[PDB]
Design a binder for this molecule. Structure first.
Ligand SMILES: CC1(C)CNCc2ccccc21
Length: 150
């Protein structure tokens, strides 16, 4: 009963969260997960500021209202060479990664490790935050509030 949450640097308080290293988060689980990080889904404006601070990924993830990939550098295999906040227009499917926004974060690039999920609740799941440098923080708990997600 174990969940890995892969997280990134924060950029103006925005970071990327990838569940179990695969597209596997629904829109409702996304909201709950950001809540567990005392965070919210970013707005498009918040994402655009993050991007300007140096944030890019090669993964689809939820923000408030859309599924996007922030791109700085054009790369053929990431959002088809687009730069800027690329918006997913057409897809059959509903599960992606998520982005989260933490207002308490530093204003620009913060590439320190994440070492807590301060707002997770009581539960049976071993939840592991995995940083990009491999550093890990684990705790027993739960964050999903929708039965359909469990
Ligand atoms: C950069 C990213 C999301 C890419 N997929 C693997 C992984 C693992 C730990 C932290 C971050 C990542």
């Amino acid at each position: 009963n174990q969940i890995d949450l892969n997280v990134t640097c924060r950029y103006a308080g925005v970071f990327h969260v990838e569940k179990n290293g695969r597209y596997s988060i629904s829109r409702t689980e996304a909201a709950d997960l950001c809540q567990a990080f005392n965070s919210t889904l970013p707005t498009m404006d918040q994402m655009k500021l993050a991007l300007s601070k140096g944030f890019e990924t090669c993964r689809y993830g939820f923000i408030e209202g859309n599924v996007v990939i922030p791109r700085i550098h054009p790369n053929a295999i990431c959002a088809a060479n687009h730069t800027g906040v690329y918006i997913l227009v057409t897809s059959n499917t509903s599960h992606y990664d998520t982005y989260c926004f933490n207002a308490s974060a530093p204003p620009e690039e913060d590439c320190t490790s994440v070492t807590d999920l301060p707002n997770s609740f009581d539960g049976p799941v071993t939840i592991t935050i995995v940083n990009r440098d491999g550093t890990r923080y684990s705790k027993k708990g739960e964050y999903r509030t929708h039965q359909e997600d469990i």
